[PDB]
Amino acid sequence: MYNTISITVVDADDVGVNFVVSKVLSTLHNKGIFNGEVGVTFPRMDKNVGDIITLFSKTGVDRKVLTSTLNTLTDFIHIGKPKEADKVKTYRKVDTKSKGKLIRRCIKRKGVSAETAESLYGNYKGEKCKLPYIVVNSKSTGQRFSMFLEECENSEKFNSYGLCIV
Amino acid sequence: MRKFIIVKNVKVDGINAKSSDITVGMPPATTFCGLGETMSIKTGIVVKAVSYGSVKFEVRGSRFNTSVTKFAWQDRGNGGKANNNSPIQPKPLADGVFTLCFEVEWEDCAEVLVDKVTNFINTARIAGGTIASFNKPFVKVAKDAEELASVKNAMMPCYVVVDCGVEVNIFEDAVNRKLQPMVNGYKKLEKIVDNKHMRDKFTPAYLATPTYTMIGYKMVSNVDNFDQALWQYGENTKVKTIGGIYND
Amino acid sequence: DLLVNEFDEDVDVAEIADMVAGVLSGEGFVTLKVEHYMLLGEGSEVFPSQEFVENSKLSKQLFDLNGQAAMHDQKIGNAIRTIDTWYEDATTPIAVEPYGSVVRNGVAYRAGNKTDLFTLMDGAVNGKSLTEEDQMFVTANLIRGGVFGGGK
Amino acid sequence: MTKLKAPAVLAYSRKINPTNALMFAVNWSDRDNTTAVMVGTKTVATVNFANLPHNKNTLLVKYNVKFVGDVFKAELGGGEYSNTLQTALENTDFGTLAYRYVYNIAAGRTLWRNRVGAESIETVITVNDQTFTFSDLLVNEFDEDVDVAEIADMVAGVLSGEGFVTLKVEHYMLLGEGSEVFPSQEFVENSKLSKQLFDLNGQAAMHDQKIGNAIRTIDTWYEDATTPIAVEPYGSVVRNGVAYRAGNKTDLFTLMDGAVNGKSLTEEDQMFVTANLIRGGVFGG
RNA sequence: CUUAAAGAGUCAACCCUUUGCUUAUCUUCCCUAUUUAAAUGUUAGCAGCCGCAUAGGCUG
């Protein structure tokens, strides 16, 4: 089995649920949690995650360090008791890069140069790389990606928020 | 409750624009009621009433004279004459774009109704004109007279036909009331004896002559009572609107 | 670019004629959406359908739909059904006509020579035997449509 | 000899008048070296941003709120209807209204997105040469504070009578260097075109009506109540696509017409109607 | 069960010469634009790595 504990966002309609949810997941990642042995799951996700953010682990979530790392947002937050269940819809983030990014790698590496080479690869762009399930956070580099959460089955290896491979 | 199906932008090319010997132009309400009844026969859907509106329309020819269509030889015993232009009756044609709305009895799901309606339209004409293209038909429904206004404005934009009755007669009403005559039905002149030459061997046959009313065109929106613009068959082998004569 | 007066063999014409003959031989329908592109040159005269009107204001009136040049549906029709290469002394395909009529030129290639639609139809109905191309001509007249009058 | 309707242009002037809010950056232990938060323009395909500088860690929001009395004297309404409604509401609990207004001011609800994620929050209020400090108050409940009641006493004296009084408000929020600050949002025609943030001489700011919607959030007397909503004649919260006082005879106009035409009002209804008259608007036609 | 059912308008074309729009002119008096307000759409996206790259995967 795992070890699950749920943080539910409540009384944040002043400031919007999803904004809080993103702030919470951010503060989690920014310092401490998700040391490779925690991951995240949203049991009420439909569009734009939802009202519940559960954390799971096989080595017991520290219910008390949560309440002091979420101390900046504790007024919009209800942390639940450690309950348990065997089964956790696991998610992973989906990247879609713009074409200008693609072209810089294709100039610096992937052998090419000048505009004529932009037009070679710049032939047809993503046309419509739409995506679903956002959570927003500004990374340490200095940009604001729009994380996309796709359901994958259990990888049992996570880095920061979501799944990985081995 | 009350279900309607709307088909917008029915581009039709080649309409038989002669509705009678003294009316050439917009096909009359008898034509669209006959279309609705043809669909009723071909699909099984019960068609309560129909409302039609012109989006574009043009009679072929000039301003005061309609175009001729070139008659092709067609009858037996004319081989000694098929080397010359065939003699020629008048048959003004027109081209247009209409929006249709049928009130229907439907209990099932909308997709089935829409697909049956499309599969019928693909086999039909309108006043003899080839149907070139139509939008995807869509269903709406109304309980009170508030949703009826939404069904009405769903046809936008188009000019629908309202019946404002006859005061004196066709010609005086055209001159004085500045309205437009329209074939609204028929008057039976004599029963036809032998069905040797008819579309049926059994259906009752009559020589007839058209009966008219005085109509007006109005933007489905500006019409208040949508019933005043829904045409159906009825009394005395005429056709008329659900809401009677137009004056709100 | 395709040769018009010869029905030369082409795999795509045949691939569409598959579905067209399937619909004609049975029931249903099939709609082809046709575009034509012609490289004529900047400012070249195009030829819309000409109107048959008694209009004293114009000596030649071109067919228009809200001011745009167009061609009558019936003229496109007369073009399509030009397939008759089976009249006597056949040269070029003519339009399917019960009398092989080309009033355009003042001749009828099926007048009074036992090969008109009515002679051949009376033959077919009254037990006589039909060539493959006489069958094709009669059925193409049926595809044309018509109100054939005279008789009893 | 019987009925009494309301004038066609019965209107009341707003009585809670907040100024616009300006946004500065300070350090939590260096509140005298203020620096202005500038609105940010940089391009994509072009939208606005507003950040704290990389050498200051506390957002400072300054504004003022003036409370104006004579809350029953209409702006365009006539005499009889408005005066009899004034008589029917003279026993309204003004103490509670003043307390909730001043608390929403002190608890910092007016900060909206700027209070989310704050290490600590401190409100500094000046009024009648008296300075009050509030620290880390709770927003979602009207907690009991002696200073909030002390200021709401003056506010209720103004509202229930004549004159005015000005609360000069500062807010300090510990957010961290380079943090995103949240001014008011301007108009956007379509999603792809330019986004814009509200400023004043280039300095980030918040609309006065937003602070007003915050201070006005006191209505807890709507059916199946829960959190406090803003005072609207129909209790409309368009963000939730509902109006918690629509079509259930708990609206402002029904209760007003009742109070004028003999019927009685609860203390909750009286507080609601007087909060509406303090909000302002046209209640006629 | 549609005034149902049916139909090739087609060839060709020099619109040409010339021209004074002239004189004169008072647009005047009066004016309350007002109450009120959450831009929402959490914004919605992308910067770097591996890559034969518009296969897939990974970094805060």
For D41-101, give the DSSP string. EE----EEE-B--TT--EEEEEEEEEEE--TTS-SS--SHHHHHHHHHTTT--HHHHHHHH
Round to a whole number and report the distance in Å from the CA of A92 to the C1' of E58.
11
DSSP string, A89-150: -EEEE-----HHHHHHHHHHTTT--HHHHHHHHSSS--S------EEEEE-SSS-EEEEEEE
Q: Compute CA distances A85 → A1, B22, D66, D106, D160, whole Å.
A: 7, 84, 56, 44, 59
Judged by CB atoms closer than 8 Å, whether chains meet at A11 and D180 is answered as no
Residue with tokens 């019928």: B120
DSSP string, chain B: --EEEEEEEEEEEEEE-EEETTEESSPPHHHHHHHHHHHHHHH--EEEEEEEEEEEEEESB-SSSBPP--PPP-SSS-GGGTTSPPP-----EEEEEEEEEEEEE--S-HHHHHHHHHHHHTT-EETTEEEEE-PPPEEEE-SSHHHHHHHHHHT-S-EEEEE---SS-HHHHHHHH--EEEEEEEEEEEE---GGGSS-SSS--EEEEEEEEEEEEEETTT-S-GGGG-EEE-GGGBEEETT-SS--
D7, D260 contact by CB (below 8 A): no
Question: Closest by alpha carbon to B138, among B97, B106, B96?
Answer: B106
C143, C24 contact by CB (below 8 A): yes
B101, B51 contact by CB (below 8 A): yes
Give Cα D273 distance to the centre of its chain.
16
B214, B173 contact by CB (below 8 A): yes
Residue C73, phi-psi category: left (phi > 0), alpha (psi -120 to 50), beta (remainder): alpha
Q: Compute CA distances B150 → A162, B134, B245, C38, whole Å.
A: 48, 21, 22, 46
Rounded-to-integer distance, Cα D232 and Cα B14, Å? 60
Neighbours of chain C (3+ CB pairs under 8 A): B
Rounded-to-integer distance, Cα B26 and Cα B161, Å? 10
Q: At what angle do helices D80-88 and D252-260 cross, to 10 degrees?
A: 90
Which chain A residue's Cα is nearest to D173? A72
Bridge partners, residue B209, by sequence? B187
Cβ-Cβ contacts under 8 Å, C151 against chain B: 76
Cβ-Cβ contacts under 8 Å, D139 against chain A: 14, 75
For B229, counting Cβ atoms within 10 Å of its Cβ (0-12 exposed, 13-18 middle, 19+ buried), the class is buried
Handedness of CA D67, D70, D72, D73 (dihedral sign): negative
Question: Closest by alpha carbon to B17, among B171, B234, B169, B182?
Answer: B182
CA neighbours closer than 13 Å in the CB half-sphere of residue C53: 23
DSSP D193: S
Between vectors from CA D216 to CA D97 and to CA D65, what angle results, nearest 5°? 90
DSSP D240: G
Cβ-Cβ contacts under 8 Å, C73 against chain B: 13-14, 130
Q: At what angle do helices D94-107 and D146-159 cross, to 10 degrees?
A: 130
| Alpha-carbon distance C5 to nearest alpha carbon in chain B (angstroms) | 23
Residue with tokens 């000899």: D1
Query: Diameter of chain D by CA atoms?
Result: 73
- Does C48 sit behind a cis peptide bond, omega within 30 degrees of 0 on the bond before it? no
CA neighbours closer than 13 Å in the CB half-sphere of residue D258: 14
Rounded-to-integer distance, Cα B165 and Cα B163, Å? 6
Rounded-to-integer distance, Cα B99 and Cα D93, Å? 62
Query: Diameter of chain A by CA atoms?
Result: 61
Specify the 3-state DSSP secondary structure of C140. helix
What is the pairing mode between strands C82-84 and C94-95? Answer: antiparallel
C81, C96 contact by CB (below 8 A): yes
3-state DSSP of C102-122: ECCCCEECCCCCCCCHHHHHH
Question: Closest by alpha carbon to B80, among A156, D158, D105, C116?
Answer: C116
* D196-207 core/surface letters (b: 16 or more CB in 10 A; e: else): bbbbeeeebbbb
Which among D112, D118, D138 has the least Cβ separation from residue A14? D112
For A87, counting Cβ atoms within 10 Å of its Cβ (0-12 exposed, 13-18 middle, 19+ buried), the class is exposed
Residue B12, phi-psi category: left (phi > 0), alpha (psi -120 to 50), beta (remainder): beta
Query: Which tokens go with A78?
Result: 């209800």
Structure determined by: X-ray
Helix (H) or strand (E) holding D23: strand D21-27
Torsion of CA C82, B68, B122, B202, to 10 degrees: -100
Bridge partners, residue D204, by sequence? D199
Whether A19 and chain D come into contact, CB under 8 Å, resolves to yes
A93, A161 contact by CB (below 8 A): yes
Which chain B residue's Cα is nearest to C67? B58
Q: Which nucleotide is nearest to D214 (CA to C1')?
A: E38
Which chain B residue's Cα is nearest to C108? B83
Asked if the Cβ of residue D149 lies within 7 A of any atom of strand E, the reply is no
Handedness of CA B118, B120, B124, B126 (dihedral sign): negative
Rounded-to-integer distance, Cα A39 and Cα A55, Å? 6
Rounded-to-integer distance, Cα D170 and Cα D24, Å? 10
Which ranges of chain C would DSSP assign to H, the alpha helix? 11-25, 73-80, 117-125, 132-144
Helix (H) or strand (E) holding D135: strand D130-135
Q: Which of residues 140-159 of A touch D (CB under 8 A)?
A: none
For A36, counting Cβ atoms within 10 Å of its Cβ (0-12 exposed, 13-18 middle, 19+ buried), the class is exposed
Count of other CB atoms within 10 angstroms of residue D248: 12
Q: Which nucleotide is nearest to B14 (CA to C1')?
A: E7
B36, B102 contact by CB (below 8 A): yes
Q: Which nucleotide is nearest to C52 (CA to C1')?
A: E9
Q: Compute CA distances C112 → A95, B79, C102, C109, C120, whole Å.
A: 80, 6, 15, 9, 12
Rounded-to-integer distance, Cα D106 and Cα D142, Å? 11
